[model samples]
Target: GVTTFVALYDYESRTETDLSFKKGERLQIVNTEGDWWLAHSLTTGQTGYIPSNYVAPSD
Candidate 1:
C-alpha cells in the first residue's frame, strides 16, 4: 500500500494539469521526491502535483 495524505486546506489549481482539492479529503501519494508531491485523489479520480504544505499525513 502507498502512503496516505489528507488535505488540510483548499488548494485551487493554477493550471489545468494541477490537482484541485478541498479540505478533509483523502489522497494517495504517488511520489514524494519532488518539491511538490505527486498524488492521486482517493475521494476522486485524478492525479497531479499538489502543494506539500496543503496536504500532509494526519500523523
Candidate 2:
C-alpha cells in the first residue's frame, strides 16, 4: 500500500512548479528527503515539494 500523510499546514509556493497543500488535506508521499518532500496533494491532485514538519502520518 502507498503511504499517505495528513497535511497539517498550508504552504505558499514562490515558484510556478510547486504544489500547494492545504490544511486538513490528504497527501500521497511520492518521495522524501529530510526537510523537503515530493508529495502529491490529493486535494489539488498535483505533485510538488512540501514541508516534512507540516505533514503528519495518516492517523
Candidate 3:
C-alpha cells in the first residue's frame, strides 16, 4: 500500500510545518496517550505529528 500524506519539515530550525497529502502520502494513526498520529519517513526511521487538516485517504 502507498502512503497517504507527506510531512514537510524545516530541520534548520527544528520545526514541522506545511503538510500536503496530494502525492500519495499519509500519516499512520497510532494510539498514544490520547489517540495520536505520526508520519513515517521512508529514508529514515523518523516520525512526527502533522496537522490533522493536511491528511487524507488515498481512495
Candidate 4:
C-alpha cells in the first residue's frame, strides 16, 4: 500500500506544528461523487482541493 502527504500547516498561519506526515509518507485517496478526500490512517482525515503541482501519484 502507498501513502500520501499534504501540507498540514502553513507558515503564514503560524500553525506549522500540524505536520503528521514526513517528507515521503504513504497516503490513500477516496472519491465520492465530485468530492475528494485524503486519508493517512484510520484516525486522521483531510478534505480539500489539492493543487495539481503539489499533488503527486504514487510510483
Best by lDDT: 1
Q: Clash pairs of candidate 1?
A: none
For model 4, residues 8-27, the per-residue Cα lDDT tens digits are 32312123322243334344
Candidate 2 lDDT, tens digit per residue, 1-59? 57789888887886766678788989888855587778888888888877788888884
Q: What does the lDDT read for residue 14 in candidate 4? A: 23
Winner on TM-score between 2 and 4 is 2
Model 3 scores what on Cα lDDT?
Answer: 0.43
Reference-based TM-score of each model = 0.83, 0.80, 0.35, 0.32
lDDT of 1 by residue, 1-59 (tens): 68888999998888867899999889888766765887899888788888888887853
Off by over 4 Å in 1: none
lDDT of each: 0.84, 0.80, 0.43, 0.36
lDDT of 3 by residue, 25-54 (tens): 435543322323455644344566645444
lDDT of model 1, residue 7: 95
Number of residue pairs clashing in candidate 4, backbone atoms closer than 3 angstroms, sequence gap of 3 or more or interchain? 4
TM-score of 4: 0.32
- Backbone clashes for every candidate come to 0, 0, 4, 4
In candidate 1, residue 29 scores what lDDT?
Answer: 81
TM-score of 1: 0.83
